[PDB]
């Protein structure tokens, strides 16, 4: 069969992916521009993400079509178009790694997040990552290439001039760079780091919740210790454990709630040190009405805020998971080409399937924000309507 027929399916799919990559991610950046709520440090890395995704459809996908033809070109010119996609991939890894750290800081030290990260500090980090993304992605340009040993038989076959080579990815980019330098160090290592970061995120989130239910049980169980106590000392051991638990749960409406609770504990605590048993048991009963009007409000506002931060971390973890699933097949084919010389090279239909699968990651991101983030979903509607 003619080669152009099989190539017609590939180019059409490649362009279809490019259209969805530009439209979807432009819609994300326009939503962040309009909405005031969507303007925060976490979303700036989201825009830095969608920035690279647009550049895939505008440059990387057109580049990938041009390489598929094997057109004649100078080895370094062919080297830039083949390595530019490596810059955008490294940009996305740094962005995804920044989001995981951001969500880790917000859940580990909530009362220090606003003092730690700001807008201007985040904007600088984006610049540093993008500069490093060019450096890593264009390392073969600095001399780690196969230009010194060009395929001459393939060049004269298509009648390339002197200094020109048949432009193909595996022909100009060394596989050791792609396996050791690119895959292992630059791709696999940061991906494993995100897995560890997200593991600590979900660990620290649930541990604060046995903490929330533990203080709630320390407050409830010791009330029944006072209700059936015999002596003045037994009420003291129950009130002192509640007083420490009351001070542990807090760390205007929030402050005044404990002002009545901890105060009423001292009202009964002083009556216990005097020896008055019955008057202490009555003063402790006042704590129940204070519990149903202030404490249970904070038990359930804390549970609500922690659940919304876990929902945000789950949504961000999906973006990293979809990045790993989309790119790994294209990387493992590089591992087979490099490590196993006895193996027959992966067929052309599979190579086409792996490339488009790596490109699909540009489209999948805006669908996740709409399905998982409520603020993004509402903002998309008003841009579509008008």
Ligand X SMILES: CC(C)CCC[C@@H](C)[C@H]1CC[C@H]2[C@@H]3CC=C4C[C@@H](O)CC[C@]4(C)[C@H]3CC[C@]12C
Ligand Y SMILES: CC(C)(C)CC(=O)Nc1c(F)cc(C(=O)Nc2nccs2)cc1F
Ligand Z SMILES: CCCCCCCC/C=C\CCCCCCCC(=O)O
Helices 189-208 and 75-108 pack at an angle, to 10 degrees, of 10
The nearer residue to ligand Y, 13 or 117, going by C-beta atoms, is 13
The nearer residue to ligand Y, 83 or 295, going by C-beta atoms, is 83
Q: Kindly give, in sequence order, each residue whose CB lies less than 8 Å from that of residue 154, ignoring residues fewer than 6 positions away.
A: 70, 165, 166, 171
Residue 85 lies near ligand Y (rule: CB under 6 A): yes
C-beta separation of 360 from 12 below 8 A: no
Site string for Na ion, 77-96 (x = CB under 5 A): ---------------x----
State the minimum distance, in angstroms, from the CB of residue 337 to ligand Y.
10
State the minimum distance, in angstroms, from the CB of residue 339 to Na ion.
26
**Using CA atoms, how far apart are residues 332 and 158, in angstroms rounded to an integer?**
30
Helices and strands counted in the chain (H then E):
19, 2
Residue 74 partner contact from ligand Z, Na ion, ligand X, none using kind-dependent CB cut-offs of 5 to 8 Å = ligand X
70 torsion bin: left (phi>0), alpha (psi -120 to 50), beta (else) = left
Figure out which of the listed residues 133, 331, 356, 365 binds ligand Y, where binding follows CB under 6 A.
331
Site string for ligand Y, 123-162 (x = CB under 6 A): ----------------------------------------
Residues within the interface to ligand Z (CB under 6 A):
6, 9-10, 13, 15, 18, 22, 57-58, 62, 65-66, 69, 71, 349, 352-353, 356-357, 360
**Using CA atoms, how far apart are residues 297 and 285, in angstroms rounded to an integer?**
19
Residue 344 partner contact from ligand X, ligand Z, Na ion, none using kind-dependent CB cut-offs of 5 to 8 Å = ligand X
Site string for ligand Y, 178-197 (x = CB under 6 A): x-------------------
Residue 367 partner contact from Na ion, ligand Z, ligand X, none using kind-dependent CB cut-offs of 5 to 8 Å = none
Full DSSP string of 329-348: HHHHHHHHHHH-SSSPPPPH
- For 54-76, give one letter per residue: b (16+ CB within 10 A) or e: bbbbebbbebbeebbebebbebe
**Using CA atoms, how far apart are residues 250 and 248, in angstroms rounded to an integer?**
6
**Using CA atoms, how far apart are residues 148 and 142, in angstroms rounded to an integer?**
13
Figure out which of the listed residues 277, 328, 356, 363 binds ligand X, where binding follows CB under 6 A.
328
* Helix, coil or strand: residue 160: coil
C-beta separation of 318 from 278 below 8 A: no
H or E element: which one contains 166? strand 164-166
State the minimum distance, in angstroms, from the CB of residue 215 to Na ion.
44
Residue 75 lies near ligand Y (rule: CB under 6 A): no
Figure out which of the listed residues 18, 229, 355, 364 binds ligand Y, where binding follows CB under 6 A.
355
Q: Kindly give, in sequence order, each residue whose CB lies less than 8 Å from that of residue 106, ignoring residues fewer than 6 positions away.
A: 113, 309
Figure out which of the listed residues 45, 84, 94, 169 binds ligand Y, where binding follows CB under 6 A.
169
What is the total count of residues that contact ligand X (CB under 6 A)? 19
Site string for ligand X, 170-189 (x = CB under 6 A): ------------------x-
What is the total count of residues that contact ligand Y (CB under 6 A)? 15
Residue 330 lies near ligand Y (rule: CB under 6 A): yes
**Using CA atoms, how far apart are residues 82 and 146, in angstroms rounded to an integer?**
13
Residue 361 partner contact from ligand Y, Na ion, ligand X, none using kind-dependent CB cut-offs of 5 to 8 Å = Na ion
**Stretch of residues binding Na ion (CB under 5 A), selected from 112-120, 256-264, 273-281, 355-363:** 355-363
The nearer residue to Na ion, 86 or 125, going by C-beta atoms, is 86
User: φ and ψ at 100, to 5 degrees?
Assistant: -65, -40
User: φ and ψ at 198, to 5 degrees?
Assistant: -70, -30
Q: Which residues would be at the binding site for ligand X (CB under 6 A)?
A: 73-74, 77, 80-81, 188, 325, 328-329, 332-333, 335-336, 339-340, 343-344, 346, 350
Q: Which residues would be at the binding site for Na ion (CB under 5 A)?
A: 92, 361
């Amino acid at each position: 069969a003619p080669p152009i027929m099989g190539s017609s399916v590939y180019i059409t799919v490649e362009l279809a992916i490019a259209v969805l990559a530009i439209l979807g991610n432009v819609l994300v950046c326009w939503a962040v521009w309009l909405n005031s709520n969507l303007q925060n440090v976490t979303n700036y890395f989201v825009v830095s993400l969608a920035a690279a995704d647009i550049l895939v459809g505008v440059l990387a996908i057109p580049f990938a079509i041009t390489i598929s033809t094997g057109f004649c070109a100078a080895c370094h010119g062919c080297l830039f178009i083949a390595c530019f996609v490596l810059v955008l991939a490294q940009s996305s890894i740094f962005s995804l790694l920044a989001i995981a750290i951001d969500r880790y800081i917000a859940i580990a030290i909530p009362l220090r997040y606003n003092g730690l990260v700001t807008g201007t500090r985040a904007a600088g980090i984006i610049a540093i990552c993008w500069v490093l993304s060019f450096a890593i992605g264009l390392t073969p340009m600095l001399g780690w290439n196969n230009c010194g040993q060009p395929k001459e038989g393939k060049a004269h076959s298509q009648g390339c001039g002197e200094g020109q080579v048949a432009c193909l990815f595996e022909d100009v980019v060394p596989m050791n760079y792609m396996v050791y330098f690119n895959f292992f160090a630059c791709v696999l290592v940061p991906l494993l780091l995100m897995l560890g970061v997200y593991l600590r995120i979900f660990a620290a989130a649930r541990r604060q919740l046995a903490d929330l239910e533990d203080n709630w049980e320390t407050l409830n169980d010791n009330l029944k210790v006072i209700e059936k106590a015999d002596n003045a000392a037994q009420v003291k051991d129950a009130l002192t454990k509640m007083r420490a638990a009351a001070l542990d749960a807090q760390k205007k409406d929030f402050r005044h709630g404990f002002d009545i609770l901890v105060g009423q504990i001292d009202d009964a605590l002083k009556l216990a040190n005097e020896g008055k048993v019955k008057e202490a048991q009555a003063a402790a009963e006042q704590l129940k009405t204070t519990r149903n009007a202030y404490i249970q409000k904070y038990l359930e506002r804390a549970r609500s805020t922690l659940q919304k931060e876990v929902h945000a971390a789950k949504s961000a973890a999906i973006i990293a998971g979809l990045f790993a699933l989309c790119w790994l097949p294209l990387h493992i084919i590089n591992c087979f080409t490099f490590f196993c010389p006895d193996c027959s090279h992966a067929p052309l239909w599979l190579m086409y399937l792996a490339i488009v699968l790596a490109h699909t990651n540009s489209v999948v991101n805006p669908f996740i924000y709409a399905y998982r983030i409520r603020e993004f979903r509402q903002t998309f509607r008003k841009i579509i309507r008008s």
